[PDB]
Design a binder for this molecule. Structure first.
Ligand SMILES: [Mg+2]
Ligand SMILES: [Mg+2]
Ligand SMILES: [Mg+2]
Ligand SMILES: [Mg+2]
Ligand SMILES: [Mg+2]
Ligand SMILES: [Mg+2]
Ligand SMILES: [Mg+2]
Ligand SMILES: [Mg+2]
Ligand SMILES: [Mg+2]
Ligand SMILES: [Mg+2]
Lengths: 386, 386, 386, 386, 386
């Protein structure tokens, strides 16, 4: 065994071309304020190197500068000098030593970046793809749903839908543009948009609706009966992440399946969502929830409950987990587009993330680790701090 | 990757010296009959070999001849030609293809033997101990509890206890000799025995009480208040395995923690015991419950619920799992004794299972796989069929 | 009283003509694998003979070779030398002596074959039909539902329906051909098929929908609202048998009654499905669940809960139980067809199973025992091992 | 098959010697009145004869004259001309045709007498003891508890206890003499009596406490903590039969197991007590609850719940059921004493009821039917009306 | 105070003209038998006379001959010599002294007849109408629903409806003619009948549907969604009275309010239906449930729960209770028709029961007691036994 030598954490600030939303607008938790700032224009890379020179690559997107401070000051020192294959111990070490403040949020996100790197490292050390160490190939290939379709003018939304359709996706997710603050008029605008998409896409494909924590219990309860006729596959994050009780009440109404979890942290955090039937579809993001070590355990819990898992974001740190579990049927897919909201920013930082072909993704059976590398292609578009 | 070439299953029938219980007697499910036949005098070895010649070793103890028929006829054909690292897929393949009849019992036991072998195989293929692939070292060493101390005359029991004490164990399990059929008099005999052990061992060590499915809801509910003063760490399998509701009711009384699970099968099977709080200590045996693939998932579920896991039996197929999870604090330890009940029979078939030192067990950080081999030492004491 | 002298167990392997599905396809638990193998091409007969020469006939279909090994090695020895009329004791003897591994699956199936034979034996010994010993005639005759109608081209399905209609059935069951893996498109194909059957059959007959464990909680929850307009009488086995919690959640949605139980074992096993309201229609098969002794007790439990019982499969081992209980209104009827899936294989092995007349079945008030005999008619089509 | 020809119902009024309680006194539902009338000084015999001359013997003790009117006017006409072996149909016929008023009480008691006779009849018709038709011998012999020991002076109670002890009983039941109306002083008198019995009997035998519906929820809740130190095996009928909720609340306190059911009627009636965990020991009397047909079904339900069944009263109509079920461990035994309260009156009417030997009862393996006959021995002590 | 002198109980057997149903047919509990016998062709009058000569009139309809035996032998002796104004004590005296067998059914019905008489007696003794002693006038007049409309040919049913409409009723109840035994075809026949009535009556009047215990849980659950579009005010007694759990499950589906209670007995009996939300409309009949003393207490319990009470049957023993409680909005009204089913038989025995005027009933503010007398008008049509 070769021990961990160092942890290199860098924050990448996008300084390249940005595209004006051209009339875009999406709901979010801040809408309640009478003040969705495109959060992902920064990203964090975490490289864990062993004494033998092997390097594992991890990442995180939430508040990169704050997370970097946590990793450099508190977490990195906890894994230096340790065997990567004692990953469960290292995870617990970080989890308990900082439990007072790292339980959720910054801390768990920091743990996530380091843990993902440790898994990439393990795969490389034994020459196996990460998904093989997690269980192997449970699917021929991974079906994916087209993730985007922000609220806009009806013509604009229908044009995007028609374009997306040409690529074979069997699922499409769309984001609402109006919420509680927009009152009754906003409800109609929301419904008009879903109808417009069914007009183009038809009813024989999955249509997912996303609120991004922009609604509340009151508003959602009244919108559910109105959304039923469009037969959505699910309604995502209708309430803020702290309103777990609201999630459970909404999911129990049994009108439209409720999904969520991208803003939930730790194994016990997601176990509660599963056990309380707060969601019918769990969507944690491995680079937030605690890493692959935590996600693998969460997948076991969700599988026993038969609440399907479809991680938030389409990246290797999520794909390998999905490939290895029967209860993880499909993945979310952000197409390789220009930098707008930021979900696609990782494509400019890394090379190796699979691109969809006729609505499916594939993983190489041999490529060791996660199958990604940090790219030099866009260094010109980034101001990287270390 | 090297593919699975064959599956060699053998049933070992002990024909060597047997020791007369000298007055032993233990409760069991059959006591209710007005008719504990020492079940383990047979054992099954399952060797899974890949094209490159590497061999993984698995095993099972329940109804070996029946399990062998299942493996040779139904399960073996399902893994031949497959990559061992697609273990989650292979597990699901066996689980679903035979779900109609293999869900629990024979089928799941057969799956267990094959899956354990596949993990030993994986460890050997990448040159890593199984526990490293499962999470690594979460404990300096593994504390173990002395498992035996069958009911006998008071003098005989106290003598065994005094001998066991000299070896540093911090926990001791004893089996009851009387049950419902023995009526009120039997209750006193049971209590006299527990008191006699506390007399020797004292109250500063763990004392576990085992019923081996020999009691029932009625009798246990009345015995609990009577056992309380002896402060047992737990009461094991007070009712038959099908009485899950009874388990939950007894555990909810909150007098003595109830343990069980050695006769439960599959991930969903144990998940139910956890979710229904049927037990406070889960004791599945990896060579029955579905193998390491299933046990790893069960450990994740139990850990989130904080219901500790202490697998039934002290063998490598259980030790590696325990080593890798924080919620698996100690192991059950059958000392290397003469063949009596059969729990120790595996010591004669395999070489490599750790022996306790001052009440602790250790695993080698380098030894690939499970760290065991099939021994030639006792071939003279076995009639092996293939 | 005459004691049990021997237990003769034989496995019948069909070697005769087989018919190509001509485009058939049905959902099943294995569909999840990216690999419904017509399981019943083998069958087991179990003859229990008493010292006086009287012979009782029992049977089983699940994994015959494995079940035969269990009967010959573990169960048969437990009933030899016993009075058939101590059936409850013999059942408990087999149940407890092998509880560790026989609780469900192979063991309980083996117990089933022996117990059914013991009842046929008892009826013959006292010269009474089995149903008379169980309670007598609660129905003038037994209404039955046509069981088949596998997924196929619309024209093929409608042709079968039209043919079935001519025989007076008031109920028809159909099997789905698409599941979770077929995504949104498969959902439409499923709905198109149910609609096509209502087109032919109309809405004034019962239409039962079968999934055969081929769907999951996620998919079923989304299909229920879509199936509602076809007013199905029930939805059968939407999830795998281990997902009892899923069964209960689906049944609680109250959209379509959920049925299941053909893959559940023992009295306590079915009692749990009843008590947890996991199903609204219980469908254990007497030659799997534990035999007539167990089924009679299960019928008592189900009756008190008013959850109707309609055993899986139309054979005498089920008909006699149904005839004797008011809560058992109808039976499933596999027509005497060519050997395809195997459900009809018993017609070639035994003689005596009633054939439907205008959608009803009848039992003879005098014929002792089950009213069946092992036939010599098709010995030419079987390779029988003993 | 021979059809039922007639139903002969007779009420036996005891006119022989009666013994003055010599200072006896026992609690009962009427104590609340500021007004336990020894109810059983009358008894009912019900003989069901078939065309071939065979006669089955049934009985009932509750309000004989009222029950006789019901049998002669409503029930008898429903079974005449029917095959005894259609017993489940005949039971349902009586149950449904009179459901409006016979559900519980008089009606169900009448059904009980007829049904018991039908079973005795069936056993005789096929030459088998009733218990053989019900499942056979599950016990070597039947342990019984001494049932009596009414409240009296301490010396009188201790003398009875000492006498009872000489006969090998492992269980003894005693009846309280004070209740709510006797206030705080009565509580002490009750406790003094239980203590006095433990003084003689010791703590290594079962001690059952009976209230006979003479207490209430309020009083019992306060008495439970006070009775705990005497370790009673159970507390019988602490509240009136209509207070099922009270039963459940008391049983849930988990201080002393609560028993009851002798005043509950029908299968669904007892199923509710079982399902609501109203009792930990079910004590229906077969000649009240609905007969052997109903009791057999109740035993199945109780067994699955593992709530033991110990029928009220020691008579053949209860013994045969107990013998055939594993969940029916012991029987209540009224010794053959002089006519005082009336529980022993059946010994003077019938011949064949087993007498205890060293605390156990036995049933003959050959004797057809219930093994009883109506005796001519005490015709001189009865005024029989027909 | 004047004490009760005697209790005169008589059974009136109708021997006058009877009308042939002309094609009528209604569901009932006995339909399950492969055998609704117009039960009420007998009736019981119970006259309680005090020493001063005042006479109170009570009655009962269930099994009159059996009830008469109970009153004469057990109950009458309990009230003789007592003050009528100690009615609560007398009720408890009868309730407790016979609790073992009178809890429900015959006993409680007997208590009902005596108690109703005692109230009529009290009203006469103080010169006040019964409803005044119970609370007074809570309603200007009592709205009533037309109770009848048995299943028949569509033309016959529509003709009755048109005739009933001319009398101003705002509510109409109809009885189903098909049940579980009639299968799918019967379901259509049932729906056709409800539709036919809505055709005539329209949707602006209450339409109540009655099953009279002729359906079961299974069938009702499937019929509810089908009945919803006819907007029935309630579905009455869909299951047998012992299936309280079924009542609660059906009522909880929230499709159509479930009513019941006419076959429930005692205060605690109805309190359970209320507390378990088994019904949304409670319909006990005062001459069955325990009398006015019990009904007054039941009305208090139901009122607090806001579960409306609409007693079964339109007679003074029910009207006075309804008049005095705000939670008792309307009454069931059997028109004064020829003797067919028997519900109208009381009109021939008594004089004083109010007749509907434009769909309303009125009570006299002065008339003492119940305001009824036993009539001599139809003595010629009765064979009265005493
Ligand atoms: Mg999202
Ligand atoms: Mg790139
Ligand atoms: Mg154990
Ligand atoms: Mg060795
Ligand atoms: Mg099926
Ligand atoms: Mg044949
Ligand atoms: Mg009693
Ligand atoms: Mg005698
Ligand atoms: Mg009614
Ligand atoms: Mg009149």
């Amino acid at each position: 065994m070769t021990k961990i030598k160092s942890v290199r954490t860098r924050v990448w600030n996008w300084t390249g071309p940005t595209v004006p939303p051209q009339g875009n607008f999406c709901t979010n938790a801040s809408d309640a304020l009478w003040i969705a700032s495109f959060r992902f224009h920064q990203w964090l890379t975490c490289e864990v190197e062993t004494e033998d020179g092997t390097i594992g690559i991890g990442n995180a997107a939430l508040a990169p500068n704050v997370v970097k401070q946590a990793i450099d000051e508190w977490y990195a020192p906890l894994v230096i000098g340790e065997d990567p294959f004692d990953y469960a111990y290292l995870w617990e070490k970080m989890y308990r030593r900082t439990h007072a403040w790292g339980r959720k949020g910054i801390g768990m996100t920091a743990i996530s970046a380091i843990d993902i790197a440790i898994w990439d490292l393990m795969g490389k050390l034994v020459g196996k793809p990460v998904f093989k160490l997690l269980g192997g190939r449970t699917k021929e290939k991974i079906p994916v749903y087209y993730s985007k379709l922000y609220a806009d003018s009806i013509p604009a939304m229908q044009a995007e839908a028609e374009e997306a359709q040409k690529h074979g996706y069997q699922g499409y997710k769309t984001r609402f543009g109006y919420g509680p603050k927009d009152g009754p008029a906003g409800m109609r605008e929301n419904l008009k948009r879903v109808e417009a998409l069914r007009e183009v896409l038809g009813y024989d494909v999955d249509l997912m609706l996303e609120c991004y924590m922009g609604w509340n219990l009151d508003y959602t309860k009244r919108m559910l009966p109105k959304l039923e006729r469009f037969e959505p596959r699910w309604l995502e994050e209708p309430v803020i992440a702290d309103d777990v009780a609201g999630y459970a009440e909404l999911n129990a109404m049994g009108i439209v399946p409720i999904s969520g979890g991208e803003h939930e942290f730790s194994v016990m955090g997601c176990a509660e969502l599963i056990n309380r039937k707060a969601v019918s579809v769990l969507q944690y993001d491995t680079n937030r929830v605690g890493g692959i070590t935590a996600a693998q355990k969460i997948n076991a819990i969700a599988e026993a409950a038969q609440i399907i898992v479809i991680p938030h974001a389409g990246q290797m740190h999520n794909y390998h987990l999905t490939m290895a579990n029967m209860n993880c049927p499909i993945s979310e897919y952000f197409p390789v587009f220009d930098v707008e909201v930021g979900n696609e920013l990782f494509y400019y930082i890394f090379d190796g993330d699979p691109e969809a072909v006729d609505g499916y993704l594939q993983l190489d059976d041999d490529t060791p680790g996660l199958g990604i590398t940090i790219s030099d292609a866009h260094l010109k578009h980034f101001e990287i701090t270390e």
